[PDB]
Amino acid sequence: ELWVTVYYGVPVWKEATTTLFCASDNVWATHCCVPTQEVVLENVTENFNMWKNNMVEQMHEDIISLWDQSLKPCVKLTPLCVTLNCTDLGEKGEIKNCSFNITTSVRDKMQKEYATFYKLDIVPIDNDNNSYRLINCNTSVITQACPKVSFEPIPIHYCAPAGFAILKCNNKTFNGTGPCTNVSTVQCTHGIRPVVSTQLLLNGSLAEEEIVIRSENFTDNGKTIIVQLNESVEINCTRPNNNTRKSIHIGPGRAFYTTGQIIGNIRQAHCNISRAKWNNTLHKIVKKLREQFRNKTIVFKQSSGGDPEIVMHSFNCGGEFFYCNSTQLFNSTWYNITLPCRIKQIINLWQEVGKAMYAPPIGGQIRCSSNITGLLLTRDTTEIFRPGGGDMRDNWRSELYKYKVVKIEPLGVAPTKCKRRV
Amino acid sequence: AEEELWVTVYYGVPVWKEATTTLFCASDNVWATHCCVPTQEVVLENVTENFNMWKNNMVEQMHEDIISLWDQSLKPCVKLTPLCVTLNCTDLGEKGEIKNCSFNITTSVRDKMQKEYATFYKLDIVPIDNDNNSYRLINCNTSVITQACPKVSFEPIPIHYCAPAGFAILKCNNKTFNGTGPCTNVSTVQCTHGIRPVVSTQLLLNGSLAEEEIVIRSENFTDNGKTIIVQLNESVEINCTRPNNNTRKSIHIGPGRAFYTTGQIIGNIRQAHCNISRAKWNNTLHKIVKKLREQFRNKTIVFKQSSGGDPEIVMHSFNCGGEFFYCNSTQLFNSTWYGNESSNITLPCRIKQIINLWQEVGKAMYAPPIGGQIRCSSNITGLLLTRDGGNNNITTEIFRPGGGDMRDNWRSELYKYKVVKIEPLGVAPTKCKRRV
Amino acid sequence: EELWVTVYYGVPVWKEATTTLFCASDNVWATHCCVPTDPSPQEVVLENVTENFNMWKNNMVEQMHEDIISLWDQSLKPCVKLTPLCVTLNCTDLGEKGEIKNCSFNITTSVRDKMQKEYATFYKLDIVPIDNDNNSYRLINCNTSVITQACPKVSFEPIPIHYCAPAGFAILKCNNKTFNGTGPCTNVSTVQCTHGIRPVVSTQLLLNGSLAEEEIVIRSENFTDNGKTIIVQLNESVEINCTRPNNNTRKSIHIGPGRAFYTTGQIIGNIRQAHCNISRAKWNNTLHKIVKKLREQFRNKTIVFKQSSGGDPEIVMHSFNCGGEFFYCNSTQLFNSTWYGNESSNITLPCRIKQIINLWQEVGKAMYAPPIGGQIRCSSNITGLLLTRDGGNNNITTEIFRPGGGDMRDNWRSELYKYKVVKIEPLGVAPTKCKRRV
Amino acid sequence: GFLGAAGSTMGAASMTLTVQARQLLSGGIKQLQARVLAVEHYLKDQQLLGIWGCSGKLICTTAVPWNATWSNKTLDNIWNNMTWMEWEKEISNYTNLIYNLIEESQNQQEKNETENLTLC
Amino acid sequence: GFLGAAGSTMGAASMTLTVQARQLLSGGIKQLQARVLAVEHYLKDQQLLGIWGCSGKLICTTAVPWNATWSNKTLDNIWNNMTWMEWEKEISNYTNLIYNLIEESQNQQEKNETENLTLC
Amino acid sequence: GFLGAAGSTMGAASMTLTVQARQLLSGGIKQLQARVLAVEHYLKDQQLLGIWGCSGKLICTTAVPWNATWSNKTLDNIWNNMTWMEWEKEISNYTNLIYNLIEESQNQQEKNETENLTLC
Amino acid sequence: XXXXXXXXXXXXXXXXXXXXXCXXXXXXXXXXXXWXXXXXXXXXXXXXXXXXXXXXXXXXXXXXXXXXXXXXXXXXXXXXXXXXXXXXXXXXXXXXCXXXXXXXXXXXXXXXXXXXXXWXXXXXXXXXX
Amino acid sequence: XXXXXXXXXXXXXXXXXXXXXCXXXXXXXXXXXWXXXXXXXXXXXXXXXXXXXXXXXXXXXXXXXXXXXXXXXXXXXXXXXXXXXXCXXXXXXXXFXXXXXXXX
Numbered sequence A: 001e002l003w004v005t006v007y008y009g010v011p012v013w014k015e016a017t018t019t020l021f022c023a024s025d026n027v028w029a030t031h032c033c034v035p036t037q038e039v040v041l042e043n044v045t046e047n048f049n050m051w052k053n054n055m056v057e058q059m060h061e062d063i064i065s066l067w068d069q070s071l072k073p074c075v076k077l078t079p080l081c082v083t084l085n086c087t088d089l090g091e092k093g094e095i096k097n098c099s100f101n102i103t104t105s106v107r108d109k110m111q112k113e114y115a116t117f118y119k120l121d122i123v124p125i126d127n128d129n130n131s132y133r134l135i136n137c138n139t140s141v142i143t144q145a146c147p148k149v150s151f152e153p154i155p156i157h158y159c160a161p162a163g164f165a166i167l168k169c170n171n172k173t174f175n176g177t178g179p180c181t182n183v184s185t186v187q188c189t190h191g192i193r194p195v196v197s198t199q200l201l202l203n204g205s206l207a208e209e210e211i212v213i214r215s216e217n218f219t220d221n222g223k224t225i226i227v228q229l230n231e232s233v234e235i236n237c238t239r240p241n242n243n244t245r246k247s248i249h250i251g252p253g254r255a256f257y258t259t260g261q262i263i264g265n266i267r268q269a270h271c272n273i274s275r276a277k278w279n280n281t282l283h284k285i286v287k288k289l290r291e292q293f294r295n296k297t298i299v300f301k302q303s304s305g306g307d308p309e310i311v312m313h314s315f316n317c318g319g320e321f322f323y324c325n326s327t328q329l330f331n332s333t334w335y336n337i338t339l340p341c342r343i344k345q346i347i348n349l350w351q352e353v354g355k356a357m358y359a360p361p362i363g364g365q366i367r368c369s370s371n372i373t374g375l376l377l378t379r380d381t382t383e384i385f386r387p388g389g390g391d392m393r394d395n396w397r398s399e400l401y402k403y404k405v406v407k408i409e410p411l412g413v414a415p416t417k418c419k420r421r422v
Numbered sequence B: 001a002e003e004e005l006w007v008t009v010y011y012g013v014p015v016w017k018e019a020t021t022t023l024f025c026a027s028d029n030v031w032a033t034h035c036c037v038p039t040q041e042v043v044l045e046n047v048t049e050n051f052n053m054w055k056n057n058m059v060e061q062m063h064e065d066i067i068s069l070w071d072q073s074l075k076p077c078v079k080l081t082p083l084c085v086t087l088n089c090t091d092l093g094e095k096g097e098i099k100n101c102s103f104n105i106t107t108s109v110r111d112k113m114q115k116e117y118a119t120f121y122k123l124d125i126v127p128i129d130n131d132n133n134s135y136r137l138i139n140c141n142t143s144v145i146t147q148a149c150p151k152v153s154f155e156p157i158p159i160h161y162c163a164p165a166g167f168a169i170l171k172c173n174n175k176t177f178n179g180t181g182p183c184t185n186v187s188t189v190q191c192t193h194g195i196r197p198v199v200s201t202q203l204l205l206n207g208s209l210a211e212e213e214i215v216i217r218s219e220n221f222t223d224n225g226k227t228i229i230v231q232l233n234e235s236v237e238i239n240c241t242r243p244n245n246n247t248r249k250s251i252h253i254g255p256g257r258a259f260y261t262t263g264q265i266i267g268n269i270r271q272a273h274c275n276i277s278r279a280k281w282n283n284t285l286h287k288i289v290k291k292l293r294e295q296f297r298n299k300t301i302v303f304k305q306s307s308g309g310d311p312e313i314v315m316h317s318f319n320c321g322g323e324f325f326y327c328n329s330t331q332l333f334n335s336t337w338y339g340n341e342s343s344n345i346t347l348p349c350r351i352k353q354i355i356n357l358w359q360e361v362g363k364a365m366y367a368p369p370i371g372g373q374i375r376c377s378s379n380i381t382g383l384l385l386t387r388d389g390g391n392n393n394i395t396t397e398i399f400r401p402g403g404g405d406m407r408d409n410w411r412s413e414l415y416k417y418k419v420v421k422i423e424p425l426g427v428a429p430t431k432c433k434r435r436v
Numbered sequence C: 001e002e003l004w005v006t007v008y009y010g011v012p013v014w015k016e017a018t019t020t021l022f023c024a025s026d027n028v029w030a031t032h033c034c035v036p037t038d039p040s041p042q043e044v045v046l047e048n049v050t051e052n053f054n055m056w057k058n059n060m061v062e063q064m065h066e067d068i069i070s071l072w073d074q075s076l077k078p079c080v081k082l083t084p085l086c087v088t089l090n091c092t093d094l095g096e097k098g099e100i101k102n103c104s105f106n107i108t109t110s111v112r113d114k115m116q117k118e119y120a121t122f123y124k125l126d127i128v129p130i131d132n133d134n135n136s137y138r139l140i141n142c143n144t145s146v147i148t149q150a151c152p153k154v155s156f157e158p159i160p161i162h163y164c165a166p167a168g169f170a171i172l173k174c175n176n177k178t179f180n181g182t183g184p185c186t187n188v189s190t191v192q193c194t195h196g197i198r199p200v201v202s203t204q205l206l207l208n209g210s211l212a213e214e215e216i217v218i219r220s221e222n223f224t225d226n227g228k229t230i231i232v233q234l235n236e237s238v239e240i241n242c243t244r245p246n247n248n249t250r251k252s253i254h255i256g257p258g259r260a261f262y263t264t265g266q267i268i269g270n271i272r273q274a275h276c277n278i279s280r281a282k283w284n285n286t287l288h289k290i291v292k293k294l295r296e297q298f299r300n301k302t303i304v305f306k307q308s309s310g311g312d313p314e315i316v317m318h319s320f321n322c323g324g325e326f327f328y329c330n331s332t333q334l335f336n337s338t339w340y341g342n343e344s345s346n347i348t349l350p351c352r353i354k355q356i357i358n359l360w361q362e363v364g365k366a367m368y369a370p371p372i373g374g375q376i377r378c379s380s381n382i383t384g385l386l387l388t389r390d391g392g393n394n395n396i397t398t399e400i401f402r403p404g405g406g407d408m409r410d411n412w413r414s415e416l417y418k419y420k421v422v423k424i425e426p427l428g429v430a431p432t433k434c435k436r437r438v
Numbered sequence D, E, F: 001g002f003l004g005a006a007g008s009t010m011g012a013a014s015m016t017l018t019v020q021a022r023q024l025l026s027g028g029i030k031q032l033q034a035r036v037l038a039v040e041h042y043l044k045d046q047q048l049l050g051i052w053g054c055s056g057k058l059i060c061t062t063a064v065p066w067n068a069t070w071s072n073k074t075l076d077n078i079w080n081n082m083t084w085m086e087w088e089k090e091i092s093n094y095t096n097l098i099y100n101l102i103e104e105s106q107n108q109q110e111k112n113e114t115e116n117l118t119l120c
Numbered sequence G: 001x002x003x004x005x006x007x008x009x010x011x012x013x014x015x016x017x018x019x020x021x022c023x024x025x026x027x028x029x030x031x032x033x034x035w036x037x038x039x040x041x042x043x044x045x046x047x048x049x050x051x052x053x054x055x056x057x058x059x060x061x062x063x064x065x066x067x068x069x070x071x072x073x074x075x076x077x078x079x080x081x082x083x084x085x086x087x088x089x090x091x092x093x094x095x096x097c098x099x100x101x102x103x104x105x106x107x108x109x110x111x112x113x114x115x116x117x118x119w120x121x122x123x124x125x126x127x128x129x
Numbered sequence H: 001x002x003x004x005x006x007x008x009x010x011x012x013x014x015x016x017x018x019x020x021x022c023x024x025x026x027x028x029x030x031x032x033x034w035x036x037x038x039x040x041x042x043x044x045x046x047x048x049x050x051x052x053x054x055x056x057x058x059x060x061x062x063x064x065x066x067x068x069x070x071x072x073x074x075x076x077x078x079x080x081x082x083x084x085x086x087c088x089x090x091x092x093x094x095x096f097x098x099x100x101x102x103x104x
C-alpha cells in the first residue's frame, strides 16, 4: 500500500568532526583573516559533552601550529649557550648583568658583550658564584620571538564549513554534559580570546545567572574543576622597571635583543587584586562547591610545589611573561592583595621536547589590567582545593563547553501513499 | 489587451568584466621548470575595450612571480657566511679592478683551517683598515650572501602567461596604441605572446619591436616623476664581451659546500665592454626625438647621463652569459637635438659578483664566475627615460636614462593585455512565458 | 539511407593515459599508503580483447620510483644531521682483521664552550684513511656529502602496497602467464588496484617478489643489444637466510641541543662475520632451469655465470636491507659456473655491514643507519634475478652473464610489467535510424 | 530558520525543505581540503539523486514498496507523532538497504526505456 | 570562435551560447586553488540556475513579467540593435532585483508542485 | 562487469551502458590533484551532455544527420561487425566536428523553443 | 506631433487584396505602441480590423476578417501596411489608422494598452467592381 | 465586448447637454473608452479610460462608468460636440458600440 518517497532538505544531523575555519573581527589577525545568524530550535534536546568536544582539540592544535609557524623565520639563540659571567644588579640577585664572549656577524671577530638576564633564565655552571648558562640551552633550541610579531590574544570565531553547523546550548546553568533542552544553531562561535594562563582564566566569558562549577566527575578527584564566574575580578599587573632595549648583533642581520640598562630603581613586578571582590568571589565559589561536596569544610591551599610553570599564575601581561605567587588568594578555610611576580624570558609553552622561546625585553614600564572570569581547581570531613588544572585544553573548554559541531544530512526517506507513477 | 514580456535566462552570454585572478605559465633552467605547461586568437569584430597598461595587474603578478621564482631557486644552495673574514688582497693586474685575495677558511673537514685564494672584483669588496691590504665582502656583515646554484640557469626564455578557465585575456591590436584608453581592434587569447623576463635598468633587451613606428608611452607626459617607455620599431644590436679567459677553481668550505672563484686568468687582463653601432644608435636617437617632439612641442631635447653615482642606479646593468655587467651608458645619452638635424660606440663595463636585484633586506646573491671568455649579442628594443623637473618656462627639456622598479620592463611587454572574467549568465525580455 | 547521430554514454572504450595513482594498503609505507584496500578486490575478464603492453615504457614504474625517492627524502628531513662528526678519528681495531673499529674523536657538544672526547664504533666500509698515520681516519664521504641520521622512530621495512587508479581510469592486467613483457596480450582483465607489491630495495637478486605461475620467464627489452637488463622471474623461490650474529648494544652521543647520534656501545661475546645461507641444491636447480630458458634466446651457445667486472661494493655486491641494517654480500659463489645444457639432474656468502649509504646516488647526500642492538636474522625469498650479458662475444660460442642490472626501476618493472593505466572514454556517437523528433 | 523545523513533526517539517536544501555551497592545504570536501559532498548528493530518479526535486516518489520489516507503523504516528531525527534513528539500520532498492528501481526503469529504443 | 559574437547583436549572439559555455570548464598550490576556484564558479552558476529552475538549459524562460522600468526599449532595439555587453551595462542596477524575482517565482512554482496533495 | 562488453559488438555492448555509467557517475598536493581531476572529469561530462540536451540519458538521439564522409559503412556492419573501440578509432578525426554540430543543433532547438508561439 | 499618415490603393478589382499603408509620420515604427487598422462600413458601424505590436512584433486581427487578415510593419520603411485577402465589394469601407501608445501602468504586464490617440486623416477603399 | 448604445439620440440644445450612454456585454474594470466621431474627421478619442478625459480632450465630459454601464456628459453642448459619441471595448476583440449620434 505504501511506497518509499525521498525527501531532500530534511532537518536532521549527526555528530561529526571536521576542520573549522577561523574568522577574526599580529599572528591572530593574519591567521584568522576571514571576516565575520542564530536560529533557536524549539522542542530539540541535544546531548553535549564538553570533555569530548573536538573543537577544543582543534583549537589546541591551531594554537600550537600558529605559534610554531610564527617562530620559524626568527633568530635562533644558539651562539649564546656559552659560559656567562654574571654579576648582581640589585631582590638582590633577581636580575643579573652577564658578560660573555660571542662571535659577531664578522667571522673570527669575537666580542665581549653584556646582556641582562633574570635569575629564572640562568643556571649555575661552576661553584665560583659567577659562571652561569642559559636555562636548558644544552638540551633545547631557544628561538627569539620576532619583535614585529605580536601574540596578543584577540577575539576569534570558529566557523563551520558548508554542510556542517554548530549547535549551541542556551541553558545558562548547563553543567557541560548531558541533554540540553534549549538548543540553537549558529555558523560561528562567539569571540574567544586565546589567553594563556595556568591557574586563573583571564579575559573570558562570564556566567549570566550564577557561578557554574563544571567537572567531568566531581567524585573522581583526578579531574580539573572549571569554575566560571558570573562577575569578573579585576587584576592590575605591572612591571615597574623602566628598561631600555639594546640590540646585540650575533650574525649577518641576525640580532639578539636584551636590556641595555634600567633607569631608576629596580622594583618587583606585582599584581593587585581587590581584597573585597576576591573575598566575595571566593565565598560564592564555596557556596557552589558545597552543593557537590555537601556538609564539608572547604579549604583553599597553594599548589604542592615545583617549577613556576606549574605552581605559579603564569600569564602574558604586555609581552612579558609573569609568574605570580597566588598563595595569598588560595589560603583560607570556609565553613588590596598584592601578588609578587617574577619575569622569565626563556619559556617552553606546551612542554615541547628540545624547543624553547626567548621573549625579548620591552623597554619602558609594563602595565596591564585583566578580568578574572574563572578558576581551575583540583581537589586533593574537609575538602582541600588547590589552584591549577590540566594542560591548556582546560582554558578553552571553559569557552567551547556550549558548542558542538554536527554534519547536516538533508536526504532521507519515508513511506507515503503515492508511487512513482511513471 | 496587454503587452506581456517575460524574463528569459541565457547561459553562455559573450560578456565579461575586469577581474584579477591567478595566471599560470607555459613555455616550449628556472623558467623551463617553473613554466612547465606545454604551449587560438579570436578577433572580436565591433568590440571596443578600455586598456590601461599602468593599472594592469598582470605586471604586478609577473613581478611577484619573478621574485618568488628567483628566491626559491637560491634556497637549496651554498651560503657564503664562512667567507665573511678579513681578506688580504693584492692587485691581480684596470689598475686594481680585479684583486687576488687570500684568507684563512675552515675547509670541508671540521676543526681544520686552510689558507685559500680567491679572485674578487673591486665592486664586491670594501676596505676595512688603513693598511691598503685588508678587505671584506661588500655587505657580508649585514646580510646573508647565497651562492647561485652552479647547475641552475637563469637565462630568460620566452614564457606565456595563461588565464584559467572561466577567464580570458584581451589583446589590443592597434599597432600605435599608447597603452591607455579605448582600443577598437580587440582579440581574445588564452595565453600571452612569448615574453622574455630580461632584467635590465635602462635599455630593454630582447623585447618586442613596434610594427609601424617608434611608440613613446607615459602615464601623463607632464609629470616628471613618471617613466617614459620608448618602444622601438627597429632594434639596435649591442655586443657585450668579457674578454678575460678565466680558469675556474672550486674550493670547499663545508660538507659538500663548494665556493666557486676564478683560479687564474690566462693571457692578459682586459676591460669588459659593449659595442653598439654608432650609425644605428644615432638614427635611433633621431627618430626618438622626432617622436618626443610631438608631446613636447617646439622644445630642444637633450640627453644626459643619470645622477646618483651608485652603479646600480646610473649604469646599464644586465645578465650576459651568467655574469652581471654594469656598463657606462654616458656615450649613448650625451647629446643635444633641436629637431632640424637630419639622420662603433664602446661602453666600458664592470663585473659585479655580489648582487641584490630586488633590494632584499639582509639578503644577497653571489654569481659564481664562468670560465673561458664571455660574449653575448642582445637587441635593444626600447628605452626607459625620465625627465628632469625645474625646466618650466625654458625651451629645453632634459631626458635621462632610467625608470622605477623592474615593473617598467615587464610593463613594456604586457601593455597590450588585460585579464577579464567571463559572466556567462544574463537575462533579457522576450514574448514567451514559461509553459507551466 | 537517412541516418542520424546518436549519443551513447557509458561505452566500453578507453585510451592509453598517464595519471597520478594513489597508494592503498591493508612506518613510512603504512603512513603514506593510508587508504584502505578493497576487502574483496574485483577483476573483470575482457573477452575478445587484445591489448598491447610494454613493461619498459610503463609510467607506473616511473611513478613508483618517484614515490620511493619522495618518501625517503621526506622521512629524512626531521632528523639529526651528522655534520659535527666530520672530524679526524683515532680508530683502533676491535678484532676480518679490523672490519669493525673503535674510533674516538674530539667533538663540540651542545655547549659551545666545551668539547668532549667521544667514542663510537664504525665499519671499515664507512671509514677512509686520510694520512700515513695508521690510526687517523674520517667518514667515507663526510667532506663531499651531508650525512643525515635516520630517525630511530621511522621504519622503512617494505610492506605490500597497491597502486590504485582514480575514478575515471582503470588498470588493465595481462593474464598470459608466459607473457614476455611487450607486444599484444590476448587475455586481458580490468582491475582498479594492482596486487600487493613490496618496495624491496636490492641490487642483484629480487627478494620477496612475485613468482611466475608456469615457468621461469626471462624478459629483456632487446636480447641482442647488450645494453639492456635481463629480468629473470622465477617460478619457485629460493630461501636466503641472512644473519648478523654480533650481539650489540646502543649508545647515544649528544652532539647538539637535542641532536643525538646513535652508535654501538659495547659488543657482547665474540665478533663474527655477517653472512647469508642459500641452499646449494635449490640454487643449482635454479641455475639449471635459468640456463634452459636462456638457451632459447641464445641458441647453441655455452652459458657462463661470472661475478661483475669490478668497482664499488654498491655495484659488485648484493645489497639489501635486513632488519634495518644494510648488508653487502659477496654473491660470487652463486654466479661462478659454466653450463652446456646437458647437465641433467649450504652456500654461505660473506657479508659486510655499511652504516653510511647513498641510495639512488644522490649528489651531496648520504644517510646514516643507526646500529640495532642484539642480533639480526632475516629469511627472504629470492624470486628473480637481474642479469647483464657482456658484449663482444658475437664471434664465440659462449655467452657471459653477470649479476646486476640498471637502476632501481628494474626491480619494480618485474612486478608492474603486467599492468597499464588507461583512461575511460564513456561518451561516443554512432549513426542510427531514429531522429530526435522533438 | 535553518533547522527550525527540527523539533516539528515530519508532516510539518517536510513543508520547509528549501530552507535546508539550499545551504550546502549556498545552494593552505587545509583550506583546499575543506573546499574540495564541500564540493565533493555537494556532488555526492547530486550523484546519488541522479542515480535515483529524483533529479532536481525536493519531494519525489519511487516505485519501491514499503517493507513492514523496516517500520510496521502506519502513516498516522509517523507523520504527526515523530520528528525526522527520531524517524532517521528508527530506520537507520535499513537506510543503505532502502537506498540500494531505490537504485535498483531506477535501473529497471532505465531498462524499460532501453527496451523502448531497441534498434533505435 | 570564443567570444566571437561579443560584438554581435543579442539575437545573433544568442546562437553561440555553447561556445562560451564549454570554455567555463576547459579553456603549485596557487594553481590548484585556481582550478578549485574555477570549479566553484561553475557550480555557483549551476546552483543559481538550479534555484531558478533552469538546470540543463541554455535558454530558460520564466514566469516573471518584464518591468518597463528596467528597460523600455522594444525587442527589435534589443535583439537586433544592441549587443550583450551594452545590455548588461544598461540593466546592471536591476540585475540582482531580477534574480531575486526569478527565485521567488520558482518558490511559488515549487509550492504549486510539492504541496498539491496530502503527503504527496 | 565493468568494461566486460568491450570485446562485444556495438549492438551487444550498447545494452550494458548502465554497467560503466554506474561506476563513472559514482565518486597533500598529490591527493588533492587526484580529487580535483576526478571532479573536473565528472563536471565536464555532465556539462557536455547538458549542452547536448542529453541530461539523464544513456542513449540520446539528435537531429544531426550522419555524414557519409565520417563513415560510409551501413548500420548492419557498424552495429554487428564492430566493437566500440574500433568504431571510435575509425571516426576519431571527426569526433570534435560531430560534437560541435550537436551543440549547434541543441542551441538552435532551445532558441526555436522561444520563437514557437504554440509553446509560449 | 506623432501623427499617423494613412494611404490606400483605393480602386481595386473585386476579390483583390485590400492593399493599404500607414506611415509613422514624426514617429518610429519600432516603438512602445500598438499600431492598428480599423474601418467604417459605409458609416453603418465602426469596427477594428487588425493590430500589430511594434514593441514585440506581435499581431492580432478581428474575427470578421479571420483567415483573410494581414498586417506588417517595418522600421526601415518607418511604416505599417496591410493587405487583407478577398476584399469583396462588402470590404469597400473607409480605412482608418491609429496608434495606441503603451504605458508602464501597474497592470502586471510590461505595458498596458491605451485608447487610440494618434489618428490618421484616413483613406477610403473602393473594392467594388 | 458586444457593447451597444443606450442613448438613441442626444441632439441637445446649447448649454444643456444630454448624456451619451451605452452598456457593455459584461462588466469589466475600466477596459472601455469614448471617441468623438466628428463628420469628415477621424474618430479621435474623447475619454481614454472609464470616461476619464483623454489627453488634450479639450472637453469637460466625464462619468463614473461603473461596471458595464458607460456614459459621458460635459453638461454643456457646443459646436465642438457635433460628432457621434461612440464607446468601445478595450478587452478581447476591440469591438465598437453603436454611436450615440449626438450631433450636438
Ligand SMILES: *[C@@H]1O[C@H](CO)[C@@H](O[C@@H]2O[C@H](CO)[C@@H](O[C@@H]3O[C@H](CO[C@H]4O[C@H](CO)[C@@H](O)[C@H](O)[C@@H]4O)[C@@H](O)[C@H](O[C@H]4O[C@H](CO)[C@@H](O)[C@H](O)[C@@H]4O)[C@@H]3O)[C@H](O)[C@H]2NC(C)=O)[C@H](O)[C@H]1NC(C)=O
Pocket: B153, B155, B156, B198, B205, B206, B318, B319, B320, B321, B322, B375, B376, B377, B378, B379
Ligand atoms: C638576448 O638573447 C641572446 C640570444 O638570443 C642572449 O645571448 C645568448 O646567451 C646564451 C646564454 O648566455 C648563449 O648560449 C651560451 O653560449 C655559450 C657559447 O656558445 C658557443 O660555443 C658553444 C660551444 O659548445 C657552441 O655550441 C655554440 O654554438 C657557440 O659557438 C655556451 O658555452 C653556453 O653553454 C653553457 O650554458 C648552457 C646552458 O644551457 C649549458 O648547457 C652548457 O653546458 C654551458 O654551461 C650557452 O650555450 C648564446 O650563445 C647567446 N647568443 C648570442 C647570439 O650571443 C642574450 O644574453 C640575451 N640578452 C639578455 C640581456 O638576456
Ligand SMILES: *[C@@H]1O[C@H](CO)[C@@H](O[C@@H]2O[C@H](CO)[C@@H](O[C@@H]3O[C@H](CO)[C@@H](O)[C@H](O)[C@@H]3O)[C@H](O)[C@H]2NC(C)=O)[C@H](O)[C@H]1NC(C)=O
Pocket: B044, B045, B046, E004, E005, E007, E008, E009, E012
Ligand atoms: C560587425 O558589424 C557589422 C556592421 O557594421 C556586421 O555586419 C552586419 O550584419 C548585419 C546582420 O547582423 C547585416 O544586416 C543584415 O543584412 C541583410 C542583408 O541581406 C538583411 O537581409 C538583414 O535583414 C540585416 O539587415 C548588415 O548588413 C551587416 N553589415 C555589413 C556592413 O556587413 C558584422 O556582422 C558585425 N560583426 C559581428 C561579429 O557580429
Ligand SMILES: *[C@@H]1O[C@H](CO)[C@@H](O)[C@H](O)[C@H]1NC(C)=O
Pocket: A234, A235, A236, A272, A273, A274, A369
Ligand atoms: C584596576 O584598575 C582599574 C582601572 O583600570 C580600576 O577600576 C580597578 O579598581 C583596579 N583594581 C585594583 C584591584 O586595583
Ligand SMILES: *[C@@H]1O[C@H](CO)[C@@H](O)[C@H](O)[C@H]1NC(C)=O
Pocket: B212, B213, B214, B233, B234, B287
Ligand atoms: C620603422 O622602421 C623602418 C625600417 O623598417 C624605418 O625606416 C622607420 O624610420 C622606422 N620608423 C620610425 C618612426 O623611426
Ligand SMILES: *[C@@H]1O[C@H](CO)[C@@H](O)[C@H](O)[C@H]1NC(C)=O
Pocket: B237, B238, B239, B275, B276, B277, B278, B344, B377
Ligand atoms: C654585433 O654582432 C652581430 C653578429 O652577431 C653583427 O651583425 C653586428 O653588426 C654587431 N654589432 C656591433 C655594434 O658590433
Ligand SMILES: *[C@@H]1O[C@H](CO)[C@@H](O)[C@H](O)[C@H]1NC(C)=O
Pocket: C239, C240, C241, C277, C278, C279, C379
Ligand atoms: C632458511 O630458513 C627457513 C626457515 O626460516 C628454512 O626453511 C630454510 O631451509 C632455510 N634455508 C637455508 C638455506 O638454510
